[PDB]
Amino acid sequence: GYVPAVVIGTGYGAAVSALRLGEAGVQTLMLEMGQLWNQPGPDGNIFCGMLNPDKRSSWFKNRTEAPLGSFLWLDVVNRNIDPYAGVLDRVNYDQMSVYVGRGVGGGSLVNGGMAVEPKRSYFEEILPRVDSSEMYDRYFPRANSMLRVNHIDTKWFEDTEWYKFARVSREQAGKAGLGTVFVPNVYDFGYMQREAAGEVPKSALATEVIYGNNHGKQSLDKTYLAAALGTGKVTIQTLHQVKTIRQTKDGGYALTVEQKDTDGKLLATKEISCRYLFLGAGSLGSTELLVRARDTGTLPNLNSEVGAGWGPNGNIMTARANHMWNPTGAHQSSIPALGIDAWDNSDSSVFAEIAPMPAGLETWVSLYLAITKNPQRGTFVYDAATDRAKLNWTRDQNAPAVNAAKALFDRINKANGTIYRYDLFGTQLKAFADDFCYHPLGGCVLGKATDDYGRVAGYKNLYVTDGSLIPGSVGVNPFVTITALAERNVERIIKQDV
Ligand SMILES: Cc1cc2nc3c(=O)[nH]c(=O)nc-3n(C[C@H](O)[C@H](O)[C@H](O)COP(=O)(O)OP(=O)(O)OC[C@H]3O[C@@H](n4cnc5c(N)ncnc54)[C@H](O)[C@@H]3O)c2cc1C
Ligand SMILES: [Mn+2]
Ligand SMILES: [Mn+2]
Ligand SMILES: [Mn+2]
Numbered sequence: 266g267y268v269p270a271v272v273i274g275t276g277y278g279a280a281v282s283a284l285r286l287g288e289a290g291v292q293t294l295m296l297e298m299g300q301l302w303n304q305p306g307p308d309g310n311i312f313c314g315m316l317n318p319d320k321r322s323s324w325f326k327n328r329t330e331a332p333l334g335s336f337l338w339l340d341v342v343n344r345n346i347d348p349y350a351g352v353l354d355r356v357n358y359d360q361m362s363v364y365v366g367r368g369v370g371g372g373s374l375v376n377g378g379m380a381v382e383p384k385r386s387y388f389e390e391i392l393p394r395v396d397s398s399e400m401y402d403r404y405f406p407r408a409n410s411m412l413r414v415n416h417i418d419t420k421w422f423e424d425t426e427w428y429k430f431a432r433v434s435r436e437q438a439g440k441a442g443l444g445t446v447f448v449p450n451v452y453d454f455g456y457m458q459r460e461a462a463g464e465v466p467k468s469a470l471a472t473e474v475i476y477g478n479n480h481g482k483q484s485l486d487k488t489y490l491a492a493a494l495g496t497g498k499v500t501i502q503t504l505h506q507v508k509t510i511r512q513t514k515d516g517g518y519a520l521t522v523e524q525k526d527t528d529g530k531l532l533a534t535k536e537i538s539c540r541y542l543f544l545g546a547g548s549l550g551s552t553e554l555l556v557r558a559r560d561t562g563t564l565p566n567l568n569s570e571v572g573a574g575w576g577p578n579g580n581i582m583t584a585r586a587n588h589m590w591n592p593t594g595a596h597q598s599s600i601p602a603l604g605i606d607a608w609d610n611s612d613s614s615v616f617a618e619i620a621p622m623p624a625g626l627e628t629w630v631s632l633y634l635a636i637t638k639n640p641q642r643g644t645f646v647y648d649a650a651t652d653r654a655k656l657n658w659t660r661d662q663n664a665p666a667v668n669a670a671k672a673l674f675d676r677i678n679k680a681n682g683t684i685y686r687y688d689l690f691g692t693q694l695k696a697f698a699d700d701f702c703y704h705p706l707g708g709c710v711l712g713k714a715t716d717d718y719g720r721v722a723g724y725k726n727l728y729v730t731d732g733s734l735i736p737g738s739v740g741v742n743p744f745v746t747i748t749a750l751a752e753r754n755v756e757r758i759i760k761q762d763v
Contacts, residue, residue, distance in 0.1 A: 268294040271520065271539040273507045273554070276371025277744050278731030279545025280489035281411075281751035287496030289759050291541070295499065296522060298506035299324070299367035300350050302374060302477060302486070312352065312477030315339065315599070315623045320346040322476040324354035324367045325529060332475050333582055333701055334632045334689050338624035350504065350527040352477050356549060358656040361577065361643075363702045365547055369501060372547070373484040373744070374477050376703075377601055378450040379618070380414040381741040387610050388746075391736050394712045400749060408748040411492070413483040417447060417454045417602045425461055427470055430593035431603040434619040434631045437591070438605050441680035443673070445603045445619070448742075451483040452600045472623045474599040482600075505535075510542065510554055511563040518542040518727065541726045541763065544709075548575065548732040552645050552708030553654040555721070555729075560647035566723035570713040572645040575656060576737025578704035579637030581663065581670040582620075583697050584686040585678060587629040597621035605633075607673055608740050612665070614638045615673040616741055630686055633674070634703070639665040642737050645708055663699040670697060704743045709733035711750070718754045720762075728758060 270286050270293040272279045279295060286293045302311050306321055313321045316339070318329035325348040331339035353375050356363045366372035382405055389397050422428050435445045452469060460470040460481070467473075468480035478484075493499040502524075509521040517540045524533040544551040556572045558564035587593060601618050608616040620632040643658035678684060685696035709715060711734040714722060719734055721727040730751050732743060739746045 267538045268292060269539060270294070270541040270543065271296060271518070271537060272543045272545055274371060274545035274547060274550060274731070275369045275485070275490060275501060276366070276373065276545055276547055276731060277485065277747040278751045279371070279543065280485045280493065281748055282543045282545060282730045282755045283499050284489050284493040284496070285752075285755040285759060287493050287498035289763060290498060291763060293499045294537070295501045296505040296507055296537070297369050297501060297503050299352070299369065299503065300527065301369045301501070301503045302352065310479045312473060312479050314471060314473045315475060316342055316472050316625065318342060318344070318476065320349035321351045322353060323349070323351040325349065326355070330355065332623060333698060334584060334620065335622055335624060337689060338626070338628065348529060350525070350529065353475060358658065360660045361656060361658045361700055361702060363549060363705050365549060365705070369503060370485040370490060375475050376744065377474055378452040378482050379601060379742040380409070380412055380449045380451055380745050383739045383741050383746050384608065384610065387608070387740045390610060391738060392711065394717050400753065404749040404753045405745070407752050408745055411489060412451055412745070412748060413488055414449045414451060415454055416449055418458065421458050422602060426594055426596050427461055427598040428602055430597045430621055430631065431601070431619045433587060433591050433593050434605070435603060437585070437631070437677055437681050437683070441676045443605055443607055443677065446606045448602055448604050448618070450600060450602070451488070452478070452481050453483065456481045457598065457600065469598050469600040470596070472599060472625060507546070507554060509561070509563055510558045512724070513538060541728070543728045543730050545730045548705035548708050551729050551731055551733040555709060556645050556647045556654045557652065560649065564724065568714060568722045570710060570722070572654065572708060573642070574710040574713060574736055575643040575645065575658070575705065575707040576639065576641065577663070577702035578706050578738055578743060579635070579639045579666045579669070580702050580704055581635045581637060581666045581697050581699055582701065583633050583635065583670055583674055584689050585631045585674065585683050586686050587631055587683065589629065592627050592629055593622070593631060595626045597623070599623065605673070610638070612638055613669055613672060614740065615669055617670070617673070630689070635670040635673070636704070636740060636742070637666040637669040638738060638740065639663065639669070641665060642707065660700050667697045667699050706732050706735040706739065706743060707737045710736050718757045720758065726762065728754070730754060
């Protein structure tokens with residue numbers, strides 16, 4: 266059927282858009298290919314933890330996987346599983362694996378909650394056509410409040426066993442002259458203190474994050490999406506995947522939408538039409554829809570920038586072996602709280618998460634997720650044979666990112682007389698994981714594939730809202746930027762277009 270506005274997906278861009286549309290009185294249908302995560306499972310919990318993965322952990326895979334960095338300790342808990350509509354999707358391209366959330370809330374279900382504003386000077390570099398004053402004066406504050414960002418208590422952090430791992434890396438970094446910063450989060454840190462005191466059910470302190478948090482984490486289903494539903498003007502249909510988009514002969518857009526069950530069986534194929542169409546299917550999903558539409562002739566006036574300009578936010582993972590006298594602890598909160606800010610906008614820039622590890626026994630490993638400044642970009646290229654966009658990124662394109670991460674961590678190793686681990690990513694000696702991405706950015710870049718508010722070039726009332734807009738890099742964990750940009754865009758689009 267017809268609905269005035271359709272939003273594809275339910276991640277950050279989508280959720281912001283739908284809230285503001287509903288508040289403007291626009292009846293809005295959100296179409297989400299994953300589940301609404303609210304049914305207690307066989308362990309009584311909605312989500313599986315990292316030490317008890319099951320089919321809930323994975324989007325249509327036949328075996329669970331260890332969290333990256335932890336195969337040596339967590340492969341023992343891996344099991345064969347039925348393909349199921351689980352929460353975390355490892356999307357494999359030829360030389361890159363991109364991890365995304367699947368469900369009501371998108372990546373907010375599976376991410377580490379880290380809510381970080383980009384450096385203004387870097388924002389101005391990457392998006393020079395955007396007025397940075399309204400971003401910092403209005404939209405970043407709006408995002409901060411709506412997301413329910415909060416801050417860890419410094420004395421609790423300093424004292425608790427659950428953050429020893431962070432304190433160890435802080436001390437090691439400090440010997441190299443490198444500073445750390447606290448990382449704001451949407452996980453309720455008050456709740457986390459109570460978990461450590463045995464006062465409330467554990468989640469972050471029970472090895473949960475990447476397959477969802479049963480408590481504590483204010484994912485988008487609790488924040489923007491709950492508010493959107495509260496307007497009375499928004500509904501969400503789950504296990505509904507948009508496959509194609511066309512402009513109807515009489516105006517507006519028509520979608521082919523597959524409804525599946527949680528086993529992936531096709532239940533129905535529906536045609537859903539609308540006046541206003543907002544894409545919030547993520548860097549991968551929105552880009553694939555538009556490359557498909559261009560190259561199959563259903564949106565033939567899309568431009569050549571559709572598909573272009575993808576980067577992995579410079580993501581690189583690495584690990585150091587601590588001295589025996591610097592154990593990192595068996596009990597590590599699953600929510601990071603500290604990072605190393607070595608980002609000055611130069612090509613040497615690194616902003617690196619001090620990542621917890623879930624093994625739950627002492628390994629002496631410090632793990633890091635580095636965000637780097639690497640100019641290389643990929644393109645999503647439609648394959649009509651398999652009906653898939655394929656990302657053409659090759660591993661050598663991450664060499665600048667590896668080189669930056671390695672220069673930084675080499676300083677820390679030199680100051681401390683430590684070495685890397687080489688065995689965390691596979692049997693081949695490899696200290697830097699260079700073929701994964703948690704932060705996909707680009708494919709439908711703001712001001713190139715779209716105008717400076719995400720209006721898709723060549724079309725009226727067709728909008729992109731999400732990580733596909735960002736030009737490959739933001740220098741920090743990306744969801745606050747996606748959120749704030751979406752606030753900016755939807756406010757302007759509603760004013761001028763709706
Ligand atoms: C392991 C991990 C850790 C992370 N940690 C952090 C962190 O701590 N902080 C941070 O800032 N970022 C973090 N990120 C990144 C962050 O989660 C993403 O940048 C963000 O979720 C992207 O938002 P989005 O709106 O672009 O898309 P998404 O959040 O990916 O949402 C897209 C939604 O659209 C749905 N969808 C896709 N295609 C279709 C379709 N055709 N039809 C219907 N529905 C569709 C998806 O199922 C999904 O629910 C992390 C991500 C991962 C995977
Ligand atoms: Mn604050
Ligand atoms: Mn519980
Ligand atoms: Mn030393």
